[PDB]
């Protein structure tokens, strides 16, 4: 199988729990699957121009017989590169922190590139239908406070954002590994983090 | 007063409801407050490097007085420029669409830059307290579908995102003008858009 790892954090593992989690899942995945093709995409090593008018118009027009501007075609070429790589993968693993309630803006731009009629969803008379139902997806997230319960739960917009968009694209039975609360309950941080790394190992073995 | 308009959509006004909404609020605000200083910040005209390790380490180390690498110092300086402008404004008006459930990634990066201990919030033994209580904020949003009720209400992450972060910074009694449902209910689009632009004019006249 071809497996794409999308890394959305360039902090060192020693300082960033989401990075420690991503690296553990990655190492465990490779150990269990020596003959898979595993590809890492580090969003901080890429040039990710923000989506705006030229990308919106270019991706709408592409393939429909319209003229494109040079700038529209440049924008389409960027989105196509990421979109085609994502579509080629049999499994996709996203590793990201919660920062300021949500995902890193680098990952927000990457997911914007994935939204394309005819590629990740199609229109029907009954509404949009997702086209990635055959892809296995894992979401690996770390967050300092607890967001699964308590007063912050209603403003969690990191895992919720990625799961909502992947669900729209048609992904089902996504796996999620979440390490939360290590900043909020610092006395238990070591055990909270270790427990997440164990869970990552178990999920990666079956993924 | 000094009023900062933050524009997050470079589609022409003829093709974009959120840009009509922004331009109507802007024109009406100026007409009604001819002697106020109005400054427009067009996020698509700016260079907005993504937040990652250099910004994070840079702001952490600046707070400690530790030496900054070139890249850390440059990152802090970029954030400073935008943060200082936001802090100097008496009122701030944000104009943005809902794209892919959320705000444009350009506005996501902009808001990331505003988060700073001692500037937009401070720590207390009882938890963080926001420091912008004095600042009047308007949120102008357009969205194709209805997100105020129905099956999609649960995944609105555009207005909810900006309102949550501004609230954390301590903004109170923010004004919100939303134009929603013009793509979902095309038979009502003319009425919905016209009503929304009238509301923006009214709110701007009193802002
Ligand atoms: C820029 C930034 C913003 C953050 N925002 C939040 C937040 O909104 N809520 C929270 O509980 N923790 C927040 N944290 C703490 C992180 O969620 C925590 O460190 C988690 O491990 C993911 O970040 P990391 O993998 O980079 O360490 C933030 C950390 C950083 C560096
Ligand atoms: C790139 C893009 C993504 C969009 N995503 C959504 C969406 O998730 N939900 C929705 O109801 N409408 C969506 N729309 C429609 C816009 O919310 C809406 O109709 C209005 O166009 C805001 O976009 P605008 O001000 O640029 O026109 C999207 C439009 C664009 C161009």
TrEMBL record, chains A, B:
Question: What's the subunit arrangement here?
Answer: Homodimer.
This enzyme's EC code(s): 1.6.5.-, 1.7.1.17
Keywords annotated in UniProt: Flavoprotein, FMN, NAD, Nucleotide-binding, Oxidoreductase
Q: Where is the signal peptide?
A: none
Q: What is the lineage of its organism?
A: Bacteria, Bacillati, Bacillota, Bacilli, Bacillales
Boundaries of every Flavodoxin-like fold domain copy: 2-202
Supply the name of the protein: FMN dependent NADH:quinone oxidoreductase
Q: Which family does it belong to?
A: Belongs to the azoreductase type 1 family.
Q: Name one Pfam family in it.
A: Flavodoxin_2
Binding-site residues for FMN, renumbered to this chain:
9, 11, 17-18, 98-101, 144-145, 147, 183
Determine the domain of life of the protein's source. Answer: Bacteria
According to its UniProt entry, what is the function of this protein? Quinone reductase that provides resistance to thiol-specific stress caused by electrophilic quinones.
Instruction: Work out whether the entry's keyword set contains Transferase.
Output: no
Catalysed reaction(s)?
Answer: N,N-dimethyl-1,4-phenylenediamine + anthranilate + 2 NAD(+) = 2-(4-dimethylaminophenyl)diazenylbenzoate + 2 NADH + 2 H(+); 2 a quinone + NADH + H(+) = 2 a 1,4-benzosemiquinone + NAD(+)
Q: Does the keyword RNA-binding apply?
A: no
Q: Show the InterPro entries listed in the entry.
A: Flavodoxin_fold, Flavoprotein-like_sf, FMN-dep_NADH:Q_OxRdtase_AzoR1, NADH:quinone_OxRdtase_FMN_depd
């Amino acid at each position: 199988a071809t497996v794409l790892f999308v890394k959305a954090n360039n902090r060192p593992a020693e300082q960033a729990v989401s990075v420690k989690l991503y690296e553990a899942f990655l190492a465990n995945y490779k150990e269990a699957h020596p003959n898979d093709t595993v590809v890492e995409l580090d969003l901080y090593k890429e040039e990710l121009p923000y989506v705006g008018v030229d990308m919106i118009n270019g991706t709408f027009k592409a393939g429909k017989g319209f003229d494109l501007t040079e700038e529209e075609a440049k924008a389409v070429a960027v989105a196509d590169k990421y979109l085609n790589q994502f579509l080629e993968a049999d499994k996709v693993v996203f590793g990201f922190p919660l920062w300021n309630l949500t995902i890193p803006a680098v990952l927000h731009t990457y997911i914007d590139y994935l939204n394309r009629a005819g590629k990740t969803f199609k229109y029907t008379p009954e509404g949009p239908v997702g086209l990635i139902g055959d892809k296995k997806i894992a979401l690996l997230n770390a967050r300092g406070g607890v967001y699964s319960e308590g007063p912050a739960a209603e403003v969690e917009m990191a895992v919720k954002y990625v799961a909502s968009m992947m669900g729209f694209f048609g992904a089902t039975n996504m796996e999620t590994v979440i390490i939360e609360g290590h900043n909020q309950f610092p006395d238990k941080a070591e055990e909270i983090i270790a427990a997440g790394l164990e869970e990552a190992a178990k999920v990666a073995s079956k993924f």
